[PDB]
Design a binder for this molecule. Sequence first.
Ligand SMILES: *Cc1cc2c(cc1C)nc1c(=O)[nH]c(=O)nc-1n2C[C@H](O)[C@H](O)[C@H](O)COP(=O)(O)OP(=O)(O)OC[C@H]1O[C@@H](n2cnc3c(N)ncnc32)[C@H](O)[C@@H]1O
Ligand SMILES: NC(=O)c1ccccc1NC(=O)Nc1cc(Cl)cc(Cl)c1
Length: 494
Amino acid sequence: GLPGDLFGLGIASRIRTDSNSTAKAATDFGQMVRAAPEAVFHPATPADIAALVRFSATSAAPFPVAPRGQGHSWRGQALAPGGVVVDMGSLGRGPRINVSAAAEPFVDAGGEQLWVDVLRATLRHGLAPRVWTDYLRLTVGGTLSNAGIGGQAFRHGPQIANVHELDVVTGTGEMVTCSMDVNSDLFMAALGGLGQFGVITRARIRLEPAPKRVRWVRLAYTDVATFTKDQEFLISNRTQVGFDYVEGQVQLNRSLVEGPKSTPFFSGADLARLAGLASRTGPTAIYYIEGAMYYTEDTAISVDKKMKALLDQLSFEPGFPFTKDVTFVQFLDRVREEERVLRSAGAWEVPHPWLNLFVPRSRILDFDDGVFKALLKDANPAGIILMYPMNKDRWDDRMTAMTPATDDDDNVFYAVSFLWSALSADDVPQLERWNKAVLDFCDRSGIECKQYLPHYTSQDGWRRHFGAKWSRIAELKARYDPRALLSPGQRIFP
Ligand SMILES: *Cc1cc2c(cc1C)nc1c(=O)[nH]c(=O)nc-1n2C[C@H](O)[C@H](O)[C@H](O)COP(=O)(O)OP(=O)(O)OC[C@H]1O[C@@H](n2cnc3c(N)ncnc32)[C@H](O)[C@@H]1O
Ligand SMILES: NC(=O)c1ccccc1NC(=O)Nc1cc(Cl)cc(Cl)c1
């Protein structure tokens, strides 16, 4: 498929066209889409990626180029059929993480670097990035191409709001350093850019002093209105003396009754006590607020009084607070333990038809009514459902990443993640029907359900997703990837 002229050049020494190489680059975490590339590119340096992109961009037959991080995509976004998959991990040679601890401390990290490896390096200097995804085995460039949301995003914004600068290889093959003050149009496009404007090869990440330990809590609710009121109180300016991390989970009645006998967080005794709570008024769903209070040797003496003062302000079910006290690393890397349990049960390397939505606060109770109370009330899917609010004023609307736009008056929106697993491959159509039912319900009810980690097969879906930002995106695309070579699996510019 690829031009014959490629194989006579220097870049071809880092090309692998064998079946074993291309098959590894053919699938992703979702395990639903298979499309092998013509070749895998193993760059030594980011300059090699630039030479590959320039060659394609100036070629008589331009081929697609897709950077692949950890392949933690589920809709074939990192796939390049008819083209080349760039193994980003190949750049991991020599020092690829540089901390400047000396004004404000920062960490320079290769786009291929795992957040887990960034954390290890910054902790040696007692520093850490401020915002984390729940899963640390994801690349820096991979999460920054989306936004990177987690429990600290309500305070500091997404990971894209915690970046000082980027090194980007554009779709023309040009290596550009960009920030808020230099090449700012490229900087803004790339953050939440879905790899459409260039490959992130470096990110300068914002740092803060690292905590020592975490007081980690889970608070159970049966009433969604009380649960949402408390989450909104917890992310508000009122609560300087609150949690550093705020998340939430939705547990359907059957997933607790017919689910595992214990989990890494909950003991068998905890789950039986929760089974009683969930059956109290017939079968009902449990909503959990998950909070975390960071502390060091200096704040260790006031943390117990701080936790008591905060919890006394909340309205979780009496007798249903759950507490852990762990190191900062144990907390940030908590999902490693969950993956370990899933892997031993053969429940990890299975299909993941995942759906992530951004729902305006004004419609969160209507969303809950049609989705958890009507659609999923008697459903028993494997996996987890996340639900937590965020603050719009911590997001930069000049960046590509989309937040809901219907309520300009309202600073709050909710992230709702349907992280289901098909324990049997033939369960995929059932989870895909649930995905479609939630989206159809949003359209039918007039709920502005903006996708996070979006996927659309046609440009009409993407135009609806980008809304008032679409013309700016199309213009930026013509400027930075005119031949539409980059990350074609996104299916925005076919
Ligand atoms: C698998 C998974 C994902 C995940 C998560 C937990 C798990 C188990 N938890 C998340 C969380 O708490 N918060 C959040 O914001 N996202 C979370 N995710 C999703 C994940 O961040 C994204 O899927 C993201 O893409 C990271 O994935 P990864 O590093 O594995 O990248 P990929 O799958 O190979 O590629 C994704 C797309 O981005 C393009 N790409 C990849 N690297 C780059 C660079 N350096 N520059 C530009 N574009 C890049 C790919 O081509 C593809 O289109
Ligand atoms: N408890 C967890 O959050 C979890 C447990 C097992 C495997 C993954 C986990 N977390 C996870 O996938 N979080 C996530 C995943 C995505 Cl795609 C998007 C967002 Cl907002 C959050």
